[PDB]
């Protein structure tokens, strides 16, 4: 008689009285990007993979006022076996 | 008699009294992008994969005021086996 | 007698008294993109895959005021087996 | 006697008193895109696939005021087997 | 005696007192797109597939004021077997 | 004695007191598209497929004021078997 | 004695007191499209298919004020078998 | 009779009375990026991988006012086996 209880909560999860007050006044933004020559050549060859930001990836992130970037991948299992029983009887 | 209880909550989940007040006043934005030559060549060859942002991918993210980017992939299992029983009787 | 209870909630899920007040006043936006030469060649060859943003993909995301981009893929299972029983009797 | 209860809620799901007040005043937007030469060649060859944004796909997303892009794929199962029983009796 | 209860709710589902107040005043939009040469060649060859945005597809999404794009594919099952019983008796 | 109850709700489903107030005042839109040469060649050859936006398809979506695009495909099953019983008696 | 109850609701379904107030004042729209040469060649050859937007299809969607495009395909089953019983007695 | 209880909470999880008051007044931002020649060549070849920010990836992150970037990958298991029993009886 096995029991497994995985209550793996996520992103802004089971929230009681949450509040996110934001404000932004008077921003002036002029984020430009200019390139004369930029050649990345990122050729990723994985075999077995499970990770979050997999990218062998030469980026260029110019941020002005706001740029929120996350990645969720919850409760994962590449190879899980939570309970087991084996018996042998081969005469 | 096995029991499994996976209450893996997600994104803004089971929320009681949530509130997101936002404001943005007076923004002035001029985000331009110019390229003379930029040739990425990202040729990703995976075999077994489970991860969130898989991309071997040379990007260029110029952000003005706001750019929200997430990725959800919940409660996943590449290979899960939660309960088991085996018996052998081959005479 | 097995029991499985997967209440894997999703996106803005089971919400009690949720509210998203937004505002945006006075934005001025001129996001242009210009390219003289940009040839990505992303030829992804996966075999077994389960992940969220699969794309080996050299993008260029210029964001003005707002650009929200997510991806949901919930409660997934590449190979799951939640309960089992085996018996052998081959004489 | 097995029991399975998968109440995997989705997008804006089971909502009590939800509200999304929005506003946008005074935007001025001129998002143009110009290309002299841009030839992506993304020829993706998968075999077994289950993920959300599958596209090996070099895009160019210029965003003005607003561009919301999600993708839902809920409660999925590449290969699931929730309960089982086996018996053998071959004399 | 098996029981299966999959109440997998969808998009704006089972909603109590939902409201989406929107407003947009004073927008001025001039989103043009011009191309001298852009030849994607995306020839995707999958074999077994179940995912949401399948497209190996180099797009160009210039967004003015608003462009909402989602994709729903709910409660799916590539190969599911929720309950079972087997017995053997071959003398 | 098996029981299956799949109340998989859909799009704007079972709604109590739903309301979508919209407004849009003063928009001026001039979204043009011009092409000197753009030849996609997307020849997708799938074998077994179940996903939502199947298209290996290099598009160009210029959006002015509003363009809403979704896709619903609910409660699907590539191969589902919800309950079963087998017995053997071949003497 | 099996029971199956699939109340899979659809699009704007079982609605209590629904309302969609819309307004649009002062739009001026001039969305033109011009092509010097654009030859897609999308020749899709599927074998077994069940998905929503099947089209390997390089489109060009210029949107002015409004263009709503969805696709419904509800409660589907590529191969479903909800209940069963088998017995063997071949002497 | 085994018991496993993994209540591995996530991001802003199980929150009682959370609040995030923000403010930002008077910012003036002009973050530009210019390149005469910058060619990264990051070609990552992993074999077995499970980590969070996998990218062998020479980036250039110029930040103006705000740029929040995280990555979540929760409760993972490259190879886990939580409980077991083995017996041998082969005469």
Author numbering:
A (entry chain B), B (entry chain C), C (entry chain D), D (entry chain E), E (entry chain F), F (entry chain G), ...: 15 to 105
What did the study's authors say about this model?
The misfolding of immunoglobulin light chains (LCs), which are constituents of natural antibodies, gives rise to the disease. In this study, we used electron cryo microscopy (cryo-EM) to determine the molecular structure of an amyloid fibril underlying the pathology in an AL patient with severe cardiac amyloidosis. The fibril protein is not glycosylated and encompasses mainly the variable light (VL) domain, which is typical for λ-AL amyloidosis. Although free LCs or LC oligomers can make pathological contributions to systemic AL amyloidosis, cardiac pathology arises largely from massive amyloid fibril deposits that impair the natural ability of the heart to pump and to contract.
The fibril consists of a single protein stack, termed here protofilament. It contains parallel cross-β sheets with intramolecular backbone hydrogen bonds. The fibril cross-section is asymmetrical, therefore a C1 symmetry was assumed during reconstruction. The fibril helix is left-hand twisted as confirmed by map-inversion and shows a pitch of ~300 nm as well as a polar topology. The three-dimensional (3D) cryo-EM map was fitted with a continuous polypeptide segment, corresponding to residues Gly15–Thr105 of the AL fibril protein. The protein N-terminal and C-terminal ends are juxtaposed in the structure and form a protruding stalk. The remaining part of the protein roughly outlines the shape of a ram head. Head region and stalk lie on either side of an intramolecular disulfide bond that is formed between residues Cys22 and Cys89 (see below). Therefore, misfolding induces a 180° rotational switch of one segment relative to the other around the disulfide bond, placing the stalk on one side of the disulfide bond and the head region on the other. There are three major internal cavities and the protein is packed inside-out or outside-in.
